[PDB]
RNA sequence: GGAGCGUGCGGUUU
RNA sequence: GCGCUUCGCUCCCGGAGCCCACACUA
RNA sequence: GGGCUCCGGAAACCGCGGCGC
């Protein structure tokens, strides 16, 4: 069924804090149901970067052509590398953060500097599956710890003589020329990187959603000139996508405005949350309409976030949602 | 000094590849089964359990070591 | 470039035929873009045609 | 006339 | 001969504007 | 006093330098 599952993948259970809590449809804007302009305002482009230009030029171009005021990308690719590169727009740019720690998946062509029997190649390839060393130690720095890097899988699809084609899943900042070169050394003959192309960046996949500069630009003009949304619409993802992999907590409509005005989020405002949350880690706070509000770091274990009733549970750090959308509802009595 | 491993081959780029059970480090003196200085290290890389030590030699003759236990001087 | 894909089927390869799949493979990396995009005009004409606009 | 991710230095038009 | 040398994000320093919110119980 | 948002921390050159076809 599968050999390709990363830490981002693992499906995390919803635990319900208040059974009854419910969202008034009138306030806010559910992602895939918000006006084209606002959809752009808070959206992310899953772009298929071409080889040639640097990761930012591409961005720069998009900004220019779409007449945006701001854009930016998370995780830069070398100009020769193509593939999945998410481009965040306008009010959404900061989301990018989320993606940096997130797992990567690639397709790579390995050229060899010498003929190794095929049978033994897919064997030395194997042993590079799991906890791998990514920098040598004993310096002046008499250390604790060490530089382990995680490689989730190595899959060899094809191998003609000196060229080797393989797919691979990797942890955050695994340098990829660096890996081939090392297996190169290890086989002896020596190797390098013919091509490379990113098939995954966290929630971002090479799928029905992945768009080239060409269709992008073009769908844009279809909207601007012919007045046709759907095509250009289906090109922009919501920002809520940039967090699909993260731990989330869902909060009563009452709580939102406080947070949008930069209040930290306290236990009585949580409707439901993800299991397995631990202390001080990035979390995304969502309205019951599954729209994002802010990012913070967990102050409590999810495992008990629900058992407690008062106190704070997320130092809110980044306000995405506008203050506008939700009324001020802390106009209480005592 | 503990043992390092059997030399599996010579890398065409200029390194002795001794396969290992424990991790050494950058600039460790590597010797021969009779304390004959062989080289210094430049890389350990691969499975944290059973790694690879790559050696950049500094005597003119490299390939003599294939299939030998190159001990790792402290 | 060398890396290839079943269009219909999505698998990757170096071969020009899909191993156990239908059609002929295409170069994986997407075609190059220039910011001038001197010819988009034409392209869009084409595209309109292909998808009733 | 601020630092880093990241390569910068010399002169002129606020 | 052509292109690139940074779109952005984090940190510091400096404004300006919102706010001080344990979450209104149907 | 505590947070959150937004605007700063320059732009247009010409000379060298660096990077890639
Ligand atoms: Zn196929």
From TrEMBL, chain B:
Highest taxon in the source lineage: Archaea
The GO biological-process annotations, alphabetized, read as: pseudouridine synthesis; ribosome biogenesis
**Name by which UniProt lists this protein:** Small nucleolar rnp gar1-like protein
């Amino acid at each position: 069924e599968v050999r390709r599952i990363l830490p981002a993948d693992i499906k995390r259970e919803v635990l319900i804090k208040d059974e009854n809590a419910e969202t008034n449809p009138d306030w806010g804007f559910p992602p895939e149901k918000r006006p084209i302009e606002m959809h752009i305002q808070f959206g992310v482009i899953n772009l298929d970067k071409p080889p040639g230009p640097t990761s930012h030029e591409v961005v720069a171009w998009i900004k220019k052509i779409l007449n945006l005021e701001k854009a930016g990308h998370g995780g830069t690719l070398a100009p020769k590398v193509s593939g999945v590169l998410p481009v965040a727009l306008e009010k959404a740019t900061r989301v990018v953060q989320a993606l940096l720690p997130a797992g990567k998946e690639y397709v790579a062509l390995m050229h060899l500097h010498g003929d190794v029997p095929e049978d033994k190649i897919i064997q030395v390839m194997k042993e590079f599956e799991g906890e791998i060393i990514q920098r040598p130690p004993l310096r002046s720095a008499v250390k604790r710890r060490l530089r382990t890097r995680k490689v989730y899988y190595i899959e060899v699809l094809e191998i003609e003589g000196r060229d080797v084609l393989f797919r691979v899943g990797v942890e955050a900042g695994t340098y990829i020329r660096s890996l081939i070169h090392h297996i190169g050394l290890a086989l002896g003959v020596g190797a390098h990187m013919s091509e490379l192309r990113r098939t995954r960046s966290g929630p971002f996949k090479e799928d029905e959603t992945l768009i080239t500069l060409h269709d992008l630009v073009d769908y844009y003009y279809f909207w601007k000139e012919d007045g046709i949304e759907e095509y250009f619409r289906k090109a922009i993802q919501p920002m809520e996508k940039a967090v699909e992999h993260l731990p989330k907590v869902w909060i009563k409509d009452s709580a939102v405005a406080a947070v949008t005005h930069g209040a930290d989020l306290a236990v009585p405002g949580i409707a439901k949350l993800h299991a397995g949350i631990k202390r001080g880690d990035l979390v995304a706070i969502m309205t019951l309409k599954d729209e994002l509000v802010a990012l913070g770091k967990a102050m409590m274990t999810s495992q008990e976030m629900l058992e407690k009733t008062k106190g704070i549970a997320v130092d809110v750090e980044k306000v995405f949602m506008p203050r506008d959308w939700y009324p001020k509802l802390w106009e209480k009595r005592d | 000094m503990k043992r390092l491993g059997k030399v599996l081959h010579y890398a065409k780029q200029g390194f002795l590849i001794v396969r290992t059970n424990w991790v050494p480090s950058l600039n460790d003196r590597v010797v021969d089964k009779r304390l004959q200085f062989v080289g210094i290290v430049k890389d350990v890389f691969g499975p944290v359990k059973m790694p690879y030590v790559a050696i950049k030699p500094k005597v003119s003759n490299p390939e003599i070591y294939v299939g030998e236990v190159l001990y790792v001087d402290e | 470039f060398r890396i290839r894909k079943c269009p219909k089927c999505g698998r990757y390869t170096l071969k020009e035929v899909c191993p156990v799949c239908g059609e002929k493979t295409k170069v994986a990396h997407p075609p190059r873009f220039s910011p001038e995009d001197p010819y988009g005009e034409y392209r869009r004409r084409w595209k309109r045609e292909v998808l009733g606009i």
